């Protein structure tokens, strides 16, 4: 009867899991699987062949860390099963065979990904029901709006979804394979100019922490670079795990600049502002005014200081001066997809949109293409 | 001796017949009547002999035969059922406010205390002294009554072979939305006005209280004073009751502090300040917030953040999200409602602990529940009220059908399965999980841009094909539900504003870490006890489910208190008022369930005109249905008359009656034309055969 | 009726009709009765005989005459019909019908008859003091003759 | 007893409804029905399958707008029922089963249209009485005249009706299938010369607004074109819903010019002035002088600035110089048909001309052919 | 004296140039201009700032490719000059200052486009004469007919032009901004369902080659989809430039389906068959029978296998059964516009229709509006 649904926002970098109706995810941990890369010499020490989540980062210095998801696509289907098993049993401490599960996926992913998630849910974990949602719709659900264009940016992909009065325009949906992971790689590359070498996968986590703590978005790039070159007031220090101290200057704002200039990492694509403007201009002329004032930002990559100010400046430069530009960046936008999924999964009217086990048995794994979206 | 006691024995039970019998009984100063085992009591607004030990011994046990109806019959019947089945039983006293349910409960309590223990009456004294506190904390003035109980009082008397143990009092179905919202010409609960009127002056200076017209939580009705009620006297009586009930001065001071904190929290306003990406509500004046913090011994900044901020808190961070004006208003109202509910629960728990029992083997339960509500302007509270009344009417109909089945098997007959259509469709229409009205309301309470109009549109779309659901013709903001008491129209005006009752964990944590013991204890207990109920409707449904779950381990007994006149005149009666009360009380549901019940000697005597019934003393095997076969070509469906005589269906009955009246017309015409023939006989053979003979003989010699 | 005839009274009924019912306009005439009375020969005069009969129901016609023959009194009034009609308004098969009861029954239902007609009937009906009217002897006397 | 009649002037583009005896229509809204053409992604948003009137234009950017009436003929009989239901219940807030209804129709429409309106009124809405009037007669009623020739032009059709002393000459009644909708289409076509593309049905409304606000009738076409080409003083700007600004020059007076030169849109018919002159010349020689001085103009298409001046100039050029030409163009001619219908339906002598329900039951839907006109 | 005219059919995607009187274009190359987007490190390598035509596709992997023409409108007027200079000098190896030039344009383009082409021809390249023709008329010239309706579809626009006995009906001319470029974009979008990501402008050419080689038009869409889902006999393989092999199934016929269902790419317009039927029904009733049997198809987008069969089926379904439907799709319809232009420019009677340099000097760039069409 009272079977609470499970909301699992398995992103490329973080797993956000919890119960429907809650205000925050119950379990948040990195989506990594680690394996030992050294020689075990003590008897009985070395009987574990895999580490998932936070225990993979506690043992970070002897493991090889691998991500099962790149750019929103699950490429390793055994590590993904390990991560889902960890989430269901060790983290949520719940039995999946008696809870409906709600999962999320990027708008323009291959269909085999969704079919394989459906098959794994219905055959390995024996869930009673299933649904796969689109992350931007859940961002709007969490934002308390029915009209707006969502700029979601995790660390796999960046996509734009314009929605008006609950109606989506699929032809105006954008997608970029440029997100937090590429920012971490670019910061790792440009940290070599000061003589800092981060090579292994365990140092990728240190570079990611540096990026989260120190990096920010400059309102204007050229004068910021001139100020950084003409003085030393923009430099900050960071302490490495072994006690060494590093210092970074213009690398603080040069790393997030690749979101607006993808040419830094050798991509021909346009910036996030131009992508958003292009997505808006692909909609009806009667929809554009409402979309201009409902720019909803979601994801962890949108958490840089000053990113909303620059997005508003760029859109104002692009859009006509008559329109009013608003960038909605709630302080909890890092969990907006999960919050929206929790809101949606707890609705009583939503109970008729689940993919039940009987429907799967009847129609194969392809039922998810007509039941979802 | 013209009136009757039990209407079950009647041969033709119609609404007109029930009204006539009830008014005949009332005109003879006979209040109580019987419907099977269901008692009906009309409030006479006059002192009647419903007491006295001689009545108790007259009704003591099964020695009377229940020839006269009385509440003592219900009491000793419940006692006998308890001693027979070794199981608990409950008596449900329903009816409108002022219809006489309260003194009915007090008389039942006195009768049980007199007949069970008859050696010690301390239990009844201890449970009667708690009545004024519950009346002050659970009643309010409505547009229909000046003192209406907005909750269901559950008194459970524990018995051990005739020994009265301690009693447990419980509350159910409390109206949460009245604490913060009142309609026109109605007030809040009496406790706030009594506190503001009868409080000592230096207490008021310590709490910075003022007259009731200034407070927002009380002045919404516009009439803060009742013409015919003294608040100070009742407040002093409440103090006397608390002193009797062991409430020390510190506890009373804490209760007054909590109530003053609620009142001051009701006076907080917000302004729409402009932020970089949103509109943020900020408190106008910090005086009220600081006053509430001082009265509740909590942090002022903590309270201001709990009112004007939303907390998303995971293991590794804690994010504060500013709220809007409406969200802040909902948070403040939810805090006030939870404070009042916790205070009432604490008072009832302390009262129960004062008279706590020892064992738990047998118990008698008394429920004082409010009845159907159909006002002019009708809204969410009455919707919940009618939902609860429908769920009680389900059990009422179950009991009535059980009595009908017992009557059908009471004598010797091949008992058939009688059809019976219960009121389950109405319950499903209101509160079925997929697309019930309350489920739609709960869904709209978290949907992004939901308002009352969208909720109405969803209801119209989902329930447009339901026979019980009805839409207005013009686009009016209302809908109609066909209850058991008739069509009721609900005005959707603040359904979403009255349903927001979500209190987050930050508020509970703030209130637990208070510098006063009672508030901290209450909130710690609440956190320990706490659930997917974030709305008033969900909590109401949970409480009603708990009340029902407490009430299937026993066979309920129903007492239906009515009202003869709205002017409280002792003797004046109206027929339309009686019809309305019978519809609302569910008495006519028995008549609806009955439709076959007609008698035997009627067929024996007044259905000979057809073929001049040849036989005499027709017996159990009398030629009765075959009479219909050879006389009226009527299908055999009337079950059996015999000894157990309940056979005739309504349409056949009317057909036979109207056949009888044609037969009377034709027989009268035949007799009258025969009598005309006799007149012409006497005329002609008078004026010739009695005159010509005399004339001829006179001419003769 | 044509099928049923009460042979005791048929002769008188037919003689009365043949003295009243003739081949005429249709109204009842004093001519035939007066001729039958004064066939021997008597001085015709109007000294004290200015009003002979005035309470006929109305005009008579041969067609309506045949209807009256078939329906009202000629060979009609089966006893079972009278007994059943009188038992219809009474619960006891004994036929003790309160006189006042029949008073209102006749004066309120059907083509309403006056108390004068009920008394006219009572001029020949034997009734007890308490009013429980019986009808066996009265019905037999009416049907056989007198 | 006092059952107020309803006057419903359902035109091709606008519905003009109200109560008899009033001075203005109570409800005026576009005669459109819209349906969603995109994908609904939010749960509960997208439960409405149709939008009628102003709510169809509020949601203009996600709907497909369709007109139930083209050229004065109802082609969609379910959308028309939806529009009538909207008018009766949501707009007038009245119960049609207790109010006589007066409807209007073009002079030379097919008979099936009138029969179907009668059937719908008497069987679906259960009106107690009905009448179908001719719009030019109502224009004369509103103008306070009994003699004159009426040039009514809505957006479906343009017709001429000459009436003398309350007597109509049916053989001189003209009709053109050229009206405001064709003007909107032609303006949409000629707006592509400056690079403005309006394609969808939602942009048809924007083009219609442009035509209403900026277009006018030139007194003489050739010198106006020469002036527009030799300077830039005739250009005006318009702001689109999304903020873009368009500019139009000679298109301002080239659009209404197709009323006098139907050859611009590829029609062989004559202009409105020549049609009016031909209709006058088909009447008796003793009627022409009075008709020449009573040219009554009605409808929304006659609302262009300078249209009356050019009509007078053209008729003066055609008619002999001896006659006196007067063009009566009252400022409220956009509502003249409704005003005349309101005047006619409130007369006490008119109560004997209604088509009652009993007459319909007796004679079928064909009673309207002998009771009306 | 014997100055041979030049025929330049500069479309949105391909340039078709040659000499009048020839049977085939002399030069056919893509209408693209590429610029380097990477860093030049070798001394002397990187002195070229632009690549036009086939040399822009040889260097495709280091350049940013841009089209000067979208939807038949020249949006970049310097790249267009570069392309014309390339065509005249490097491809045709001819001096433009001594050859009359014939150019083509879509029927309903902005006038500024034509005026600017005239100005560029007469002021930059100093041609002695000029003419701008309509592509559908040249298609009829190449088809050897004087009566028929032409469905031209390049990769910028799709237009219908009905012509009867050499007389055009301008009011029945249709235009759609849906053509080969939109088909390439839609195929690129729907290729992501199998996990193939084509992002840059250089991969647009690969997707275009895939569309040209593998895509076809299904006779009926629903049963074709059912067959493709129920088996795997409709799948074909394609080899990418670096050796990777991709496989596509229902995408082969789902891409050209947007010509008949523009709703796939979020357009409200009607299919090409309904557009052709609507254009036919806008003509005179005495012209329709001849037009029904002279449906001439032209352009590269009409080169899909099975497109003529489906066009005939759809028109037969729409048109009455009495009429006879013929779809004329010559095997060389990809060059029909150029062939017709070559035929027209070589006529002796056409020598009086050129726009000479003297006329341009007298009348400005606006002479082309009255001399052409
Ligand atoms: N405060 C921050 N500043 C900058 N980057 C951040 C911040 N917080 C998280 N990120 C980046 O965002 C990415 C994770 O965001 P998330 O939305 O959880 O991704 P996903 O949903 O794909 O798992 C990580 O690469 C992380 O480095
Ligand atoms: N001020 C105006 N100038 C030009 N055209 C107008 C004006 N007002 C309305 N119209 C046009 O007139 C048409 C509507 O007129 P109306 O008489 O209401 O039509 P109908 O009676 O057929 O509904 C519309 O096409 C509208 O664009
Ligand atoms: N065989 C083919 N099958 C499908 N599409 C083709 C084929 N050949 C060319 N095309 C498409 O037609 C378009 C070019 O046709 P063309 O008539 O030269 O265009 P334009 O005249 O606008 O330059 C290109 O998009 C190309 O992909
Ligand atoms: Mg009109």
- In sequence order, what DSSP letters do the residues of B166-188 get, joined into one string? EEEEEEES--STTTT---TT--S
The secondary structure element, H or E, covering residue B698 is helix B692-699
Q: Determine the residue of chain C that is closest to B609 in CA distance.
A: C88
Q: Which one of the listed residues B148, B261, B352, B423 is annotated catalytic?
A: B148
Q: Which atom of ligand 1 is nearest to the CA of A298?
A: 17
CB contact under 8 A, D90 and B473: no
Greatest distance between any 2 Cα atoms in chain B:
149
Chain A positions touching E194 (Cβ under 8 A) are: 110-112
Burial class from Cβ neighbours inside 10 Å (0-12, 13-18, 19+) for residue A66 reads: middle
- Report the distance separating Cα A70 and Cα A91, nearest Å: 23
Contacts of E172 (CB under 8 A, 6+ apart): D266, E160, E162, E279, E280, E282, E283
What residue has token string 């000479």?
E356
- Report the distance separating Cα C31 and Cα C22, nearest Å: 11
Q: Please work out whether the CB of residue A300 comes within 6 Å of at least one atom of ligand 1.
A: yes
E5-28 CB burial, b ≥16 within 10 A, e <16: bbbbbbbbbbbbbbbbeeeebbbb
In chain D, DSSP finds a helix count (H) and a strand count (E) of: 14, 20
For chain C, how are helix, strand and coil distributed in percent, rounded to 5?
Answer: 45, 5, 50
- A358 to A2, A6, A130: CA distances (angstroms): 20, 19, 11
Torsion from C-alpha of C107, C113, C114, C120, nearest 10 degrees: -120
What residue has token string 């936008």?
A333
What residue has token string 């620059």?
A310
Do the two chains B and E touch, given a threshold of 8 Å on CB pairs and at least 3 pairs? no
Question: Cα of E299 to ligand 3 centre, how many Å?
Answer: 7
What one-character DSSP code corresponds to residue D122? H
- C1 to C61, C70, C74: CA distances (angstroms): 18, 4, 6
Residues D43 and D147 in one domain: no
For residue D242, give the nearest of A137, A285, A373 by CB distance: A285
Residues A189 and A251 in one domain: yes
Q: Taking a C-beta distance cutoff of 8 angstroms, is the pair D333, D302 a contact?
A: yes
Torsion from C-alpha of B644, B650, B656, B661, nearest 10 degrees: 120
Residues D186 and D216 in one domain: yes
Residues E200 and E247 in one domain: yes
Chain B positions touching C53 (Cβ under 8 A) are: 687
Domain boundary among A48, A66, A84: A66
Q: What is the CATH number of the domain that holds A47?
A: 2.30.36.70
> What's the number of CA atoms in the CB half-sphere (13 Å) around residue B662?
6
- B247 to B166, B192, B250, B514: CA distances (angstroms): 19, 19, 8, 21
Residues E157 and E119 in one domain: no
Query: Which of A285, A296, A346, A347 is the best mutation test for D, with the most CBs of D within 10 A?
Result: A285
- Report the distance separating Cα B157 and Cα B366, nearest Å: 8
Q: Taking a C-beta distance cutoff of 8 angstroms, is the pair B655, C96 a contact?
A: no
Closest-CA residue to A109 (of A129, A90, A133): A133
Q: Taking a C-beta distance cutoff of 8 angstroms, is the pair B156, B167 a contact?
A: yes
Asked about B208 being catalytic, the answer comes back as: no
For residue A288, give the nearest of D60, D203, D242 by CB distance: D242
Query: Which of B681, B683, B693 is the best mutation test for C, with the most CBs of C within 10 A?
Result: B681
Domain with E190, as residue range(s), is 180-265
Asked about B254 being catalytic, the answer comes back as: no
Closest-CA residue to A8 (of A162, A163, A120, A146): A120
Neighbours of chain B (3+ CB pairs under 8 A): A, C, D
E153-182 CB burial, b ≥16 within 10 A, e <16: bbbbbbbbbbbbeeebbebbbbbbbbbbbb
Q: Taking a C-beta distance cutoff of 8 angstroms, is the pair E326, E293 a contact?
A: yes
Length of chain B: 701
Would the CA dihedral through B602, B604, B605, B609 be positive or negative? positive
Domain tally, chain E: 4
C10 touching B, CB under 8 A? Answer: no
What residue has token string 């990611």?
A208
Residues D113 and D201 in one domain: no
For residue B673, give the nearest of C72, C80, C106 by CB distance: C72
Domain boundary among A66, A85, A114: A66
DSSP-derived 3-state class of residue B412: coil
Count of CB atoms within 10 A of residue D19's CB? 17
Closest-CA residue to B59 (of B109, B114, B1): B114
CA A38 to chain centre: 32
Contacts of B672 (CB under 8 A, 6+ apart): C106, C110, C111, C113
Q: Taking a C-beta distance cutoff of 8 angstroms, is the pair E33, E56 a contact?
A: yes
CA E5 to chain centre: 22
Question: Cα of E192 to ligand 2 centre, how many Å?
Answer: 49
Compute φ and ψ for D182, nearest 5 degrees: -65, -35
Compute φ and ψ for D364, nearest 5 degrees: 75, -175
What is the DSSP track for E16-81? EEEETT-SS-SEEEE--EEEE-S---STTTT----EETHHHHHTTTTEEEE-SEETTEE--HHHHH
Residues pairing with D236 in the sheet = D248
Torsion from C-alpha of E282, E288, E294, E298, nearest 10 degrees: 0
- Report the distance separating Cα A137 and Cα A132, nearest Å: 12
Q: Taking a C-beta distance cutoff of 8 angstroms, is the pair B155, B127 a contact?
A: yes
- Report the distance separating Cα B430 and Cα B540, nearest Å: 13
Q: Which one of the listed residues B21, B43, B97, B423 is annotated catalytic?
A: B97
The secondary structure element, H or E, covering residue E107 is none
Would the CA dihedral through D231, D234, D237, D238 be positive or negative? negative
For chain B, how are helix, strand and coil distributed in percent, rounded to 5?
Answer: 50, 15, 40
Residues E273 and E356 in one domain: no
A169-196 CB burial, b ≥16 within 10 A, e <16: bbbbbbbbbbbbbbbbebbbebbeeeeb
B316 touching A, CB under 8 A? Answer: yes
Among A28, A106, A155, A253, the mutation site with the greatest number of ligand 1 atoms within 8 A of its Cβ is A155
Q: Please work out whether the CB of residue A152 comes within 6 Å of at least one atom of ligand 1.
A: no
Asked about B102 being catalytic, the answer comes back as: yes
Query: Which of D195, D204, D205 is the best mutation test for E, with the most CBs of E within 10 A?
Result: D195
Distance from CA of D48 to the nearest CA of B (A): 9
CB contact under 8 A, D195 and E110: yes
B314 touching A, CB under 8 A? Answer: yes
Asked about B635 being catalytic, the answer comes back as: no
Residues E290 and E308 in one domain: yes
DSSP-derived 3-state class of residue A273: helix
Count of CB atoms within 10 A of residue E263's CB? 15
The secondary structure element, H or E, covering residue A327 is strand A327-328
Length of chain C: 146
Burial class from Cβ neighbours inside 10 Å (0-12, 13-18, 19+) for residue B145 reads: middle
Closest-CA residue to B515 (of B286, B299, B302, B346): B299
Chain C positions touching B608 (Cβ under 8 A) are: 87
Residues A175 and A191 in one domain: no
Compute φ and ψ for A209, nearest 5 degrees: -65, -40
DSSP-derived 3-state class of residue B529: helix
For residue E192, give the nearest of A108, A170, A263 by CB distance: A108
3-class DSSP string for C86-130: HHHCCCCCCCCEEHHHHHHHHHHCCCCCCHHHHHHHHCCCCCCCC
Pairing of strands D295-298, D148-153: parallel
Residue of the nearest CA to atom 10 in ligand 2?
D300
Residues pairing with E64 in the sheet = E35
Expressed in Å, this structure's resolution amounts to: 3.2
Q: Determine the residue of chain E that is closest to D61 in CA distance.
A: E268
Residue range B392-491 in CATH 1.20.58.530:
yes
Burial class from Cβ neighbours inside 10 Å (0-12, 13-18, 19+) for residue B46 reads: exposed
- Report the distance separating Cα A182 and Cα A70, nearest Å: 11
A103-115 CB burial, b ≥16 within 10 A, e <16: bbbbbbbbeebbb
DSSP-derived 3-state class of residue B41: strand
Residues pairing with D69 in the sheet = D74
- B61 to B5, B65, B67: CA distances (angstroms): 19, 9, 13
Question: Cα of E222 to ligand 3 centre, how many Å?
Answer: 26
Residues E298 and E170 in one domain: yes
Asked about B373 being catalytic, the answer comes back as: yes
Asked about B486 being catalytic, the answer comes back as: no
Query: Which of B447, B459, B474, B475 is the best mutation test for D, with the most CBs of D within 10 A?
Result: B474
Strands (E) in B492-648, as ranges, are 557-562
Q: What is the CATH number of the domain that holds D197?
A: 3.90.640.10
Q: Which atom of ligand 3 is nearest to the CA of E156?
A: 22
Residues A13 and A104 in one domain: yes
What one-character DSSP code corresponds to residue D88? I
Among D53, D68, D139, D155, the mutation site with the greatest number of ligand 2 atoms within 8 A of its Cβ is D155
Closest-CA residue to B308 (of B288, B287, B323): B323
Q: Taking a C-beta distance cutoff of 8 angstroms, is the pair A12, A155 a contact?
A: yes
CA B599 to chain centre: 34
DSSP-derived 3-state class of residue B428: helix
Q: Taking a C-beta distance cutoff of 8 angstroms, is the pair E10, E2 a contact?
A: no
Residues pairing with D351 in the sheet = none
Strands (E) in chain D, as ranges, are 6-10, 14-19, 27-30, 33-36, 39-40, 51-52, 63-66, 69-70, 73-74, 101-105, 129-134, 148-153, 158-164, 167-168, 174-176, 236-239, 245-248, 295-298, 327-328, 355-356
Count of CB atoms within 10 A of residue D305's CB? 12
CA angle centred on B441, ends B438 and B444, rounded to 5°: 155
Residues D249 and D197 in one domain: yes
Asked about B371 being catalytic, the answer comes back as: yes
Q: Which atom of ligand 3 is nearest to the CA of E153?
A: 17
Distance from CA of E42 to the nearest CA of D (A): 45
Contacts of E183 (CB under 8 A, 6+ apart): E155, E211, E215, E255, E256, E258, E259, E301
First-to-last alpha carbon distance for chain A, in angstroms, is 27
- Report the distance separating Cα C122 and Cα C131, nearest Å: 11
For residue D193, give the nearest of E111, E170, E266 by CB distance: E111
Tokens at residue E306, please?
A: 């099975």
Full set of structural domains in chain C with CATH: 7-72 (1.10.238.10), 79-144 (1.10.238.10)
DSSP-derived 3-state class of residue E146: coil
First-to-last alpha carbon distance for chain B, in angstroms, is 72
What is the DSSP track for D232-247? STT-EEEE-TTS-EEE
Question: Cα of D56 to ligand 4 centre, how many Å?
Answer: 21
Asked about B97 being catalytic, the answer comes back as: yes
Compute φ and ψ for E17, nearest 5 degrees: -125, 155
- C11 to B434, C7, C74: CA distances (angstroms): 91, 7, 10
Q: Please work out whether the CB of residue A193 comes within 6 Å of at least one atom of ligand 1.
A: no
What residue has token string 């910061």?
A187
Distance from CA of D89 to the nearest CA of A (A): 26
Q: Is B100 part of any known ligand binding site?
A: yes
Helices (H), E135-281: 135-143, 180-190, 201-214, 221-230, 251-254, 272-281
The CATH label, of 3.40.605.10, 3.40.190.10, 3.90.226.10, 3.40.850.10, for the domain at B7-171+354-382+553-594 is 3.40.850.10
Length of chain D: 373
Q: Which ligand is nearest to the CA of A106?
A: 1
- Report the distance separating Cα E38 and Cα B677, nearest Å: 133
Q: Is B230 part of any known ligand binding site?
A: no
Q: Taking a C-beta distance cutoff of 8 angstroms, is the pair A278, A174 a contact?
A: yes
Domain boundaries, chain B: 7-171+354-382+553-594, 392-491, 601-666
């Amino acid at each position: 009867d009272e079977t609470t649904a499970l909301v699992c926002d398995n992103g490329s970098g973080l797993v956000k899991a919890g119960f429907a109706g809650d205000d925050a995810p119950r379990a948040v941990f990195p989506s990594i699987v680690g394996r030992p890369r050294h020689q075990g010499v003590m008897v009985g020490m070395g009987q574990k062949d895999s580490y998932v989540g936070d225990e993979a980062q506690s043992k970070r210095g002897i493991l090889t860390l691998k991500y099962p998801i790149e750019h929103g696509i699950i490429t390793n289907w055994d590590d993904m099963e390990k991560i889902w098993h960890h989430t269901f049993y060790n983290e949520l401490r719940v039995a999946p065979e008696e809870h409906p599960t709600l999962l999320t996926e990027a708008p323009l992913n291959p269909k085999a990904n969704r079919e394989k998630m459906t098959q794994i849910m219905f055959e390995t974990f024996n869930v009673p029901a299933m649904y796969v949602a689109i992350q931007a719709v859940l961002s709007l659900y969490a934002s308390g709006r029915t009209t707006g264009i969502v700029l979601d940016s995790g660390d796999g992909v960046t996509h734009n979804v314009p929605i008006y009065e609950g109606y989506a325009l699929p032809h105006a949906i954008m997608r970029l394979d440029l997100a937090g992971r590429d920012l971490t790689d670019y910061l790792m590359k440009i940290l070599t100019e000061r003589g800092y070498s981060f090579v292994t996968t365990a140092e990728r986590e240190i570079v990611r922490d540096i990026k989260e703590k120190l990096c920010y978005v400059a309102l204007d790039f050229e004068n910021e670079m001139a100020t950084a070159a003409s003085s030393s007031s923009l430099e900050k220090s960071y302490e490495l795990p072994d006690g060494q101290v590093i210092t970074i200057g213009n690398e603080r704002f040069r790393c997030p600049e690749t979101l607006f200039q993808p040419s830094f990492i050798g991509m021909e694509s346009a910036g996030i502002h131009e992508t958003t403007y292009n997505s808006i201009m692909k909609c009806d002329i009667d929809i554009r005014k409402d979309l201009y004032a409902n720019n909803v930002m979601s994801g962890g990559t949108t958490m840089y200081p000053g990113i909303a100010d620059r997005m508003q400046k760029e859109i104002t430069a692009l859009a006509p001066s008559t329109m009013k530009i608003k960038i909605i960046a709630p302080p909890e936008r890092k969990y907006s997809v999960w919050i929206g999924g929790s809101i949606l999964a707890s609705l009583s009217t939503f109970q008729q949109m689940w993919i039940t086990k009987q429907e799967y048995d009847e129609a194969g794994p392809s039922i998810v293409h007509r039941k979802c979206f | 001796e013209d009136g009757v006691e039990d209407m079950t024995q009647l041969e033709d039970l119609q609404e007109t017949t029930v009204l006539a019998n009830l008014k005949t009984r009332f005109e003879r100063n006979l209040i109580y009547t019987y419907i099977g085992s269901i008692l009906v009591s009309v409030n006479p607004y006059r002192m009647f002999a419903i007491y006295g030990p001689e009545q108790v011994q007259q009704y003591s046990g099964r020695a009377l035969g229940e020839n006269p109806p009385h509440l003592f019959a219900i009491a000793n019947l419940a006692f006998a059922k308890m001693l027979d089945a070794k199981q608990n039983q409950c008596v449900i006293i329903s009816g409108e406010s002022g219809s006489g349910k309260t003194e009915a409960t007090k008389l039942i309590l006195r009768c049980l205390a007199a007949m069970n223990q008859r050696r010690d009456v301390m239990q009844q004294i201890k449970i009667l002294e708690a009545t004024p506190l519950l009346e002050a904390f659970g009643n309010a003035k409505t547009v229909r009554n000046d003192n209406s109980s907005r909750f269901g009082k559950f008194v459970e008397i524990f018995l051990e072979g005739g020994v009265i143990c301690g009693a447990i009092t419980s509350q159910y179905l409390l109206e949460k939305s009245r604490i913060v919202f009142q309609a026109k010409n109605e007030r809040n609960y009496h406790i706030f006005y009594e506190l503001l009127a009868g409080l000592p002056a230096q207490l008021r200076q310590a709490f910075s209280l003022q007259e009731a017209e200034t407070y927002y939580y009380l002045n919404q009705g516009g009439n803060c004073e009742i013409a015919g009620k003294s608040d100070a006297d009742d407040f002093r009586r409440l103090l006397a009751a608390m002193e009797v009930l062991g409430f020390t001065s510190e506890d009373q001071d804490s209760i007054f502090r909590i109530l003053a904190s609620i009142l001051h929290l009701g006076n907080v306003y917000f302004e729409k300040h402009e932020t970089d990406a949103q509109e943020v509500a900020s408190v106008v004046s910090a005086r009220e917030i600081q006053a509430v913090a001082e009265l509740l011994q909590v942090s002022p900044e903590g309270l201001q953040k709990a009112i004007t901020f939303k907390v998303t808190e995971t293991i590794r961070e804690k994010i504060f999200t500013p709220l809007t004006v409406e969200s802040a208003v909902d948070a403040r109202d939810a805090i006030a409602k939870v404070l009042y509910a916790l205070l009432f629960g604490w008072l009832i728990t302390r009262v129960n602990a004062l008279v706590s029992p020892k064992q738990d083997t047998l118990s008698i339960a008394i429920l004082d529940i409010y009845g159907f509500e159909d006002l002019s302007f009708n809204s969410f509270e009455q919707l919940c009220i009618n939902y609860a009344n429908e769920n009680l009417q389900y059990l009422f109909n179950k009991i009535v059908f059980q009595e009908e089945q017992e009557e059908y098997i009471r004598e010797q007959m091949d008992w058939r399965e009688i059809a019976f259509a219960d009121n389950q469709p109405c319950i499903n229409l209101i509160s079925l999980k997929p697309y019930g009205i309350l489920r739609i309301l709960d869904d709209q309470c978290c949907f992004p841009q939901a308002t009352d109009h969208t909720f109405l549109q969803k209801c119209h779309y989902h329930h447009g094909a339901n026979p019980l659901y009805s839409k207005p013709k013009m686009p009016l903001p209302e809908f109609t539900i066909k209850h058991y008491a008739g069509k009721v129209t609900y005005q959707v005006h603040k359904f979403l504003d009255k349903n927001h009752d979500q209190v987050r964990q930050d508020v509970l944590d703030l209130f637990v870490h208070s510098r006063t013991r009672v508030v901290a204890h209450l909130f710690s207990s609440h956190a320990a006890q706490t659930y997917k109920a974030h709305t008033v409707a969900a909590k109401f449904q949970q409480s009603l489910l708990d009340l029902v779950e407490k009430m299937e381990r026993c066979n309920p007994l129903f007492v239906r208190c009515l009202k003869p006149n709205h002017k409280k005149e002792p003797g004046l009666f109206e027929p339309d008022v009686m019809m309305a009360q019978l519809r609302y009380s569910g008495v006519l549901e028995t008549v609806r369930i009955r439709k076959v019940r007609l008698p035997f000697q009627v067929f024996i005597d007044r259905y000979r005109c057809l073929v001049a019934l040849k036989l005499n003393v027709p017996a159990d095997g009398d030629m009765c249905v075959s009479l219909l076969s050879r006389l009226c070509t009527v299908t055999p469906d009337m079950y059996r008359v015999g000894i157990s005589k309940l056979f005739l269906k309504e349409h056949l009955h009317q057909l036979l009656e109207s056949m009888r009246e044609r037969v009377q017309n034709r027989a009268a015409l035949t007799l009258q034309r025969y009598l005309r023939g006799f007149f012409i006989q006497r005329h002609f053979r008078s004026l010739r055969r009695k005159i010509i003979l005399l004339q001829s003989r006179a001419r003769g010699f | 009726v044509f099928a049923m005839f009460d042979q005791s009274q048929i002769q008188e009924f037919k003689e009365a009709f043949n003295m009243i019912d003739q081949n005429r306009d249709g109204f009842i005439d004093k001519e035939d009765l007066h001729d039958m009375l004064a066939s021997l020969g008597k001085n015709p005069t109007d000294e004290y005989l200015d009003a002979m009969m005035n309470e006929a129901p109305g005009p008579i016609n041969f067609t309506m005459f045949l209807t009256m023959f078939g329906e009202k009194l000629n060979g009609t009034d089966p006893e079972d019909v009278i007994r059943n009609a009188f038992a219809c308004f009474d619960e006891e098969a004994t036929g003790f019908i309160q006189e006042d009861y029949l008073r209102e029954l006749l004066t309120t239902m059907g083509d309403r008859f006056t108390d004068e007609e009920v008394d006219e009937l009572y001029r020949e009906a034997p009734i007890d003091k308490k009013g429980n009217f019986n009808y066996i002897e009265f019905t037999r006397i009416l049907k056989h003759g007198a």
